[PDB]
């Protein structure tokens, strides 16, 4: 059996099964357990983070380290769609853990409070949903939990949500987060996650923002004064080394040689607005509503929703060959016509993504107007019948296009039989579109998958994509390397109520922006003066 420095006898017949990065992760988790601190397994999806957690907890139970003779009661807060998976994983790796699910489905068939009491009384392994943490936040937190594992802990990304407060009401030193991305939009989410795992390490959120978030974003613009970008680099370095020993994040660059990965290509099509759609958009951006938005007298949010609706299709905003949702009145639907026809002639299989469920229904009606066989899964479908549809799409070839919104289903529902994917409209979060493209291109994908993002040039959608890239750049700067070539302008990125459609004489805004493509008190002093000159 493998043995660590202080003595943590992870069993040989489990430890041998792990991969090198998995064993490194178990080492890191147990270093945290010795320091009595929490962490974030920020390894991206597909590497396997549940295996690391069960291996580490099993070693902690067999090693009988101690308070508690070995491992005590632990709570795992995960989305419903994976709860049963978790128990099966335990039951196949380490059987003697009395694992139990808290759910209406469940297995207890009695009062749930009795389940919490009984499981804690046996030092069991208890799995919940985030909603049960929120609802029983006073009840579930009375039985001296030894570990808290927030699987997909990006549910805590908001420092305001009641789930965040209910999850931060736990008392143990041991807080582990299993999230594919600690931050998705901005540094609010990084702060919230670190306030969970380690209450004191990063400062109070005001302090954190005023020190890190504002300088970094101010240095994320290409029109920033040199002092601003240098301060942003320095502050990013400080945040990086502050979070270094508590965020274990591994990419698919170092671990790529261990597992295969088919090549992925991606294009961003810029779909010109149709003349009627262009007229409607120009009338809205000239109407008094956007003027009141610019005055601040009305919520800008409704104007955003309206312009997104216009760029999707005029029939959304406005409300034979003239029925609801005719595909000839929006240029993005023209390109979807061309791509769907060509891909059907190629015999491939398509994922059709869109943030709007109404335009998802419009796309359904369009597909019915054509003769493409298809299958739909969205939020309106019952969850108990979600797994069949996916399976029926993945097993046969007699279904051509599968319809999604970016945010339906559990994280990473296995849509492997698809070959091509089209994202009909961009979202504000880079992570939801990254998840959309990732869902088709996962482990065990047989053929080269390509993603086509559909944009309308010079419109709100182009600015949504620009914001998405900007947030992605911020996340990358924080998480992998601070030095980064600056792409954007502060005023152009934030002003998003104009219409400059290209005439093909001049290039599009995105291509114009992307036009180029003990210490001995002297090392200590050298590092201090180095950081200070920046």
């Amino acid at each position: 059996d493998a043995e660590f420095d202080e003595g943590f006898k992870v069993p040989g017949f489990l430890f041998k099964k792990l991969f090198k990065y998995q064993q490194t992760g178990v080492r890191w988790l147990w270093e945290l357990h010795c320091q009595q601190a929490g962490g974030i397994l920020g390894d991206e999806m597909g590497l396997g983070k549940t295996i690391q957690i069960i291996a580490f907890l099993a070693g902690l139970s067999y090693s009988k380290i101690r308070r508690f003779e070995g491992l005590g009661p632990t709570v795992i807060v995960c989305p419903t769609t994976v709860m049963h998976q978790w128990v099966k994983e335990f039951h196949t790796w380490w059987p003697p853990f009395r694992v139990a699910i808290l759910h209406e489905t469940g297995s207890y068939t009695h009062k749930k409070e009795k389940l919490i009491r009984d499981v804690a009384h046996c030092h069991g392994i208890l799995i919940t949903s985030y909603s049960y943490i929120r609802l029983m936040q006073d009840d579930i937190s009375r039985y001296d939990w030894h570990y808290v594992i927030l699987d997909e802990g990006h549910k805590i990304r908001n420092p305001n949500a009641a789930v965040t407060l209910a999850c931060k009401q736990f008392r143990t030193p041991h807080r582990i987060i299993l999230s594919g991305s600690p931050m998705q939009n901005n540094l609010r989410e990084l702060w919230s996650l670190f306030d969970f795992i380690f209450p004191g390490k990063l400062g109070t959120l005001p302090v954190f923002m005023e020190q890190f978030s504002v300088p970094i974003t101010m240095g994320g613009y290409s029109n920033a004064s040199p002092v601003q970008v240098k301060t942003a680099y320095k502050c990013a370095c400080v945040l990086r080394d502050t979070i270094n020993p508590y965020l274990l994040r591994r990419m698919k660059s170092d671990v790529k040689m261990s597992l295969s990965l088919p090549d992925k290509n991606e294009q961003v099509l810029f779909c010109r607005l149709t003349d009627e759609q262009h007229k409607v958009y120009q009338n809205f951006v000239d109407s008094k509503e956007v003027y009141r938005i610019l005055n601040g007298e009305m919520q800008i949010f409704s104007g955003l929703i309206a312009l997104r609706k216009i760029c999707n299709h005029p029939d959304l905003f406005s409300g034979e060959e003239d029925q609801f949702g005719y595909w000839k009145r929006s240029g993005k639907m023209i390109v979807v016509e061309s791509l769907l026809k060509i891909w059907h002639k190629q015999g491939q299989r398509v994922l059709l993504f869109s943030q709007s469920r109404q335009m998802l229904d419009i796309l359904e009606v369009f597909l019915r107007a054509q003769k493409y066989t298809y299958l739909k899964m969205d939020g309106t479908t019952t969850i108990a019948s979600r797994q069949p549809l996916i399976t029926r799409y993945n097993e046969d070839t007699s279904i051509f296009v599968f319809l999604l919104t970016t945010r339906v289903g559990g994280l990473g529902v296995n849509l492997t039989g698809a070959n091509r994917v089209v994202i009909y409209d961009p979202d504000w979060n880079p992570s939801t579109d990254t998840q959309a493209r990732e869902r088709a291109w996962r482990i065990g994908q047989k053929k080269q998958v390509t993603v086509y993002r559909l944009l309308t040039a010079g419109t709100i959608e182009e600015k949504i994509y620009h914001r998405q890239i900007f947030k992605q750049f911020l996340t990358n700067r924080v998480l992998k390397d601070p030095k980064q070539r600056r792409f954007f302008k502060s005023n152009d990125l934030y002003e998003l109520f104009t219409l400059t459609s290209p005439d093909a004489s001049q290039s599009t805004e995105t291509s114009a922006i992307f036009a180029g493509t003990p210490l001995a008190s002297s090392s200590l002093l050298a590092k201090m003066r180095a950081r200070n000159h920046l």
């Binding site: 420092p159 305001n160 407060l165 109070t204 959120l205 005001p206």
Partner: protein
């Protein structure tokens, strides 16, 4: 104590714009600052900021 709607009627106007009463606006102010203060006292907030 929030009073009922009859103490602070929302009178309708020549069109559809429903004008609220001064008490309703003031309760809006109290509610917003109460919620905001609540999230500060719940979280870590400077003693002078809480004050």
């Amino acid at each position: 104590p929030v009073p009922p709607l009859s103490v602070r009627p929302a009178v309708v106007m020549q069109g559809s714009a429903r004008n609220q009463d001064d008490l309703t606006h003031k309760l809006a102010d109290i509610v917003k600052i109460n919620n905001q203060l609540r999230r500060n006292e719940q979280n870590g907030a400077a003693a002078h900021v809480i004050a």
